[PDB]
């Protein structure tokens, strides 16, 4: 009876290790990424206050559509970049959430960069 | 699978020749002879002396009767 690992738990161990060294400030807030089997979520968090400033998900009505997960990640990155710009945020630090920086995570990050967030 | 490390591997028909019983599966044997499958494409055939449908243990077939007891051998030998 071989056990099956909980991918989210493994991810969270990795994420806590990343977050020891990576934290978001009011002037340079942290762009956190959460990834599921279907959707991708992004927040911009000031860890000094522990408050979110902007959010964007592939599950949101504005972004939900019929596209590949990577395309949805691109759209989520663009949306979060736009909302951050509207709230007056340019510098951020990218928290890959413990996921490998690749594929959907990388597409979201590059979309935010292109939309104008300065890492 | 990685490229170039694994041996050549392809579908073959294992043919138990005793019962002329065919079944398709993968293997690296690469036997030359080709016999048509139910599907149109042929694949190389591997001659098999024995198989699951030809082994006495699998089939339950008893090749030879059990050894006679001592009383029975006594009686049959001496006619009594």
């Amino acid at each position: 009876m071989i056990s099956k690992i909980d991918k989210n738990k493994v991810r969270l161990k990795r994420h806590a290790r990343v977050r020891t060294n990576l934290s978001g400030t009011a002037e340079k807030p942290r762009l956190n990424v959460y990834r599921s089997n279907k959707h991708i979520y992004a927040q911009i968090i000031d860890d000094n206050k522990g408050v979110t400033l902007a959010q964007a998900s592939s599950k949101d009505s504005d972004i939900a559509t019929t596209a590949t997960k990577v395309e949805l990640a691109t759209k989520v990155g663009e949306a979060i970049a736009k909302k951050a710009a509207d709230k007056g945020i340019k510098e951020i630090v990218f928290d890959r959430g413990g996921y490998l920086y690749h594929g959907r995570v990388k597409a979201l990050a590059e979309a935010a960069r292109e939309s104008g967030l300065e890492f | 699978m990685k490229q170039g490390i694994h041996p050549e591997y392809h579908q073959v028909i294992f043919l138990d020749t005793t019962t002329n019983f065919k079944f398709l599966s993968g293997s690296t044997k690469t036997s030359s002879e080709m016999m048509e499958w139910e599907d149109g494409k042929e694949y190389p055939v591997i001659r098999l002396d024995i198989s699951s449908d030809s082994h006495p243990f699998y089939t339950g077939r008893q090749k030879f009767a059990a050894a006679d007891g001592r009383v029975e051998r006594f009686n049959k030998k001496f006619g009594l």
Binding site: - | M1, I5, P7, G26, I50, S51, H55, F57
Partner: protein
């Protein structure tokens, strides 16, 4: 994928009816097959391990991982890190092909075959079969076999109990 189709169609239904599973996700399946060969004489002659690796690769279809000593043991004259085994993990279609081949073409080639041990279950639904000679497998020609050596085949299943594992393997067609 003949064996996989059999599992999907007949074995699933038989096993679920027998064990009263409220959902199909409870139906045991063969998670993986690990074929291991411990070559301790590789300490004295590495060519033995090389031949063993080649034979295991021919049997399984994929390159084996060479396993090295985890610790040094004086009596065996074994130093930590010395390669003393080979291992192949099979999953999916290759696993099913190897399993049906082992049940049908290979096992009957065992000399004086009388079935496989019915008690060789770890106690948690996994079955280990010890083959005593490689010549069993149809892919090996006895001419090229410098030495005859065995293998351990570990069928790792999702069954929680030896009873369910036995039912699964029997339905697949394992002699006992």
């Amino acid at each position: 994928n003949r064996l996989k189709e059999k599992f999907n169609t007949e074995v699933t239904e038989n096993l679920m009816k027998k064990f009263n599973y409220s959902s199909v996700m409870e139906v045991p399946k063969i998670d993986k097959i690990v074929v291991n060969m411990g070559v301790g004489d590789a300490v004295q002659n590495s060519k033995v391990l090389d031949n063993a690796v080649e034979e295991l690769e021919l049997i399984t279809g994929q390159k084996p991982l060479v396993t090295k000593a985890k610790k040094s043991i004086a009596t065996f004259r074994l130093r930590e890190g010395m390669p003393i085994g080979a291992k192949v993990t099979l999953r999916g279609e290759r696993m099913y092909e190897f399993l049906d081949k082992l049940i049908s073409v290979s096992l009957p080639r065992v000399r004086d075959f009388q079935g496989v041990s019915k008690k060789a279950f770890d106690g948690r639904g996994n079955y280990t079969l010890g083959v005593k000679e490689q010549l069993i497998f149809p892919e090996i020609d006895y001419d090229k076999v410098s030495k005859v050596r065995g293998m351990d085949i570990v069928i790792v299943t999702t069954a929680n109990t030896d009873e369910e594992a036995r039912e699964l393997l029997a339905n697949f067609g394992m002699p006992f």
